[PDB]
Design a protein around this ligand. Sequence first.
Ligand code: X4M
Lengths: 179, 179
Amino acid sequence: NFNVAHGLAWSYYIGYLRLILPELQARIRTYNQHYNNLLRGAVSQRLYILLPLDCGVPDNLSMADPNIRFLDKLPQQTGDRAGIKDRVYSNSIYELLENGQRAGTCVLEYATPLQTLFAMSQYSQAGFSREDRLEQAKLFCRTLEDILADAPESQNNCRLIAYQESFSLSQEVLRHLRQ
Amino acid sequence: NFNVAHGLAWSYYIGYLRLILPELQARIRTYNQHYNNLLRGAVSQRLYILLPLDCGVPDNLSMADPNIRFLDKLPQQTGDRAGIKDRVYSNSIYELLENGQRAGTCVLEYATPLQTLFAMSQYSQAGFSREDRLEQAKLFCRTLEDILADAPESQNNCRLIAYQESFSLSQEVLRHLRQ
Ligand SMILES: Nc1nc2c(ncn2[C@@H]2O[C@@H]3CO[P@@](=O)(S)O[C@H]4C[C@H](Oc5ccncn5)C[C@@H]4CO[P@@](=O)(S)O[C@@H]2[C@@H]3O)c(=O)[nH]1
């Protein structure tokens, strides 16, 4: 079963991180210079990737924590991909609240393949148990860490936030953001 | 190694086909009614998915065959996905030429995971041989066929075009399109 998370981690790098991480600093610089509110803090460098090991991935982050609120989108990145003209890669900027006030602003999202591991564990024909899922989530993160450790597109460009669940997601992101 | 193509096929269904196939007929109907040139044929129903078993997936289809030409995009499908506000799913309409004249119009693309299998075979750290790749491409298609055969979102909504390479890609699509 090893090969499920191995494949998904390689697919996440090849099909997403290696394509968007090289251009991310320029998109954030563009946002900060031309789109960011004049009075607010600069959007932090780096893509922050949430890796819940229970593979609980809501689509709406902005509601999953009261202290994480959607602010804005980066400029879109588009390119021809496998016969799709101008396929769109979009990223969302979030404010992180601490004591009701803004403590940080960053590009934040879940690793969408963890949502796949979760769905595969639920489908009879995938032949993937809820025990397989925790082991595969750990292997997914370890494989991604190992890829990015040798990856030339990763130039201080992303931070992996792995966690297991009271737990505060905003505090967990702020701890990485403040390093 | 089985588990690489198994995972990618499940991920392609869960993360893409099960999300876009339910809404595809409505997007094509919208295109035909409101956006299609009044004088041209209706865009055919169904998403046509190219599955080259050599995993050769160019990003620009429109140049990879002189007889396949980009025409237009469908209306975009957007939704919140894993913390991405309004992630964009886009599909491209192609004309198929026969004897220099239009013989068909359809929504056409490559299965992007086959591009992943190809890249994994090229990266030393993926531990995936060019022999592994042909076997995994076949298993990817077989797994996807088996998923879609039980899939309620597939309501005569897509056609898998698997092929191995002189070979005419346009003729291969027209044969499926005319059935
Ligand atoms: N956050 C984030 N993740 C992304 C994004 N793009 C890819 N990924 C992840 O990178 C890996 C490799 O991607 P591929 O394009 S070879 O495979 C995709 C192909 C198909 O999707 C689409 C979508 C739009 N148009 C055509 N096809 C389902 C399959 C898995 O799709 P997922 O979005 S569940 O996860 C993928 C996958 O894990 C993105 O824009 N944002």
